[PDB]
Amino acid sequence: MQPLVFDMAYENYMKRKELQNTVSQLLESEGWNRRNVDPFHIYFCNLKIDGALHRELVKRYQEKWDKLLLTSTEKSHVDLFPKDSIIYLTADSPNVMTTFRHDKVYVIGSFVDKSMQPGTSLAKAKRLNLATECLPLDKYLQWEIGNKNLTLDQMIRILLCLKNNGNWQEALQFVPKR
């Protein structure tokens, strides 16, 4: 089964409100995955034991934390999968995605910043020499803009649709317009 990584290396950038939002978005994402008959194997990487995120899950969502269908680890995506197979997703990337690939491990940053902290994830990728891509939002949604920095549950639904052989118009229905 194809892995999909949520990178938990952003905790230091967030306040109590935004960390909470991140946790809400991750729970929602795992739920969309459980609905699908051809799901991803979800990995929570860089999840520091007894950090703010792990503590938030354990103190405030213990019942829900014990039943998620995923693998969580302190290790990095680069410690587990070969660098050649990694693609870090970020709206700041200069490479526009054209093709969903079944032999790649996509990485999504676990970060709610309200577009106030650009480049953050692009740099975390460059520093380890990882390939990056952005979603083709301009190409397939001229005007209707909104902000191009989507939520974590939006990203998984798009990628699920493409994984299950949907075209770009179908996949991008999950993007709120205006």
Ligand X SMILES: C[S@@+](CC[C@H](N)C(=O)[O-])C[C@H]1O[C@@H](n2cnc3c(N)ncnc32)[C@H](O)[C@@H]1O
Interaction mask 72-101, ligand X, x per CB under 6 A: -----------------xxx----------
CB closer to ligand X, 14 vs 62 = 14
What would you report as the CA-atom Rg of the chain, rounded to the nearest whole angstrom?
16
- Which of 33, 46, 72, 149 is close enough to bind ligand X by CB under 6 A? 149
Size (the chain), residues? 178
Tell me: does residue 113 bind ligand X (CB under 6 A): yes
- Greatest Cα-to-Cα distance within the chain, rounded to the nearest angstrom: 44
* Min separation Cβ 87 and ligand X, Å: 10
- Please tell me the distance from the alpha carbon of residue 133 to that of residue 94, in angstroms, as a whole number: 7
Tell me: does residue 33 bind ligand X (CB under 6 A): no
* Beta strands, E only, 19-135: 41-45, 71-72, 86-89, 105-109, 131-133
Which residues are near ligand X by CB under 6 A?
89-91, 108-109, 111-113, 117-121, 134-135, 137, 148-150, 155
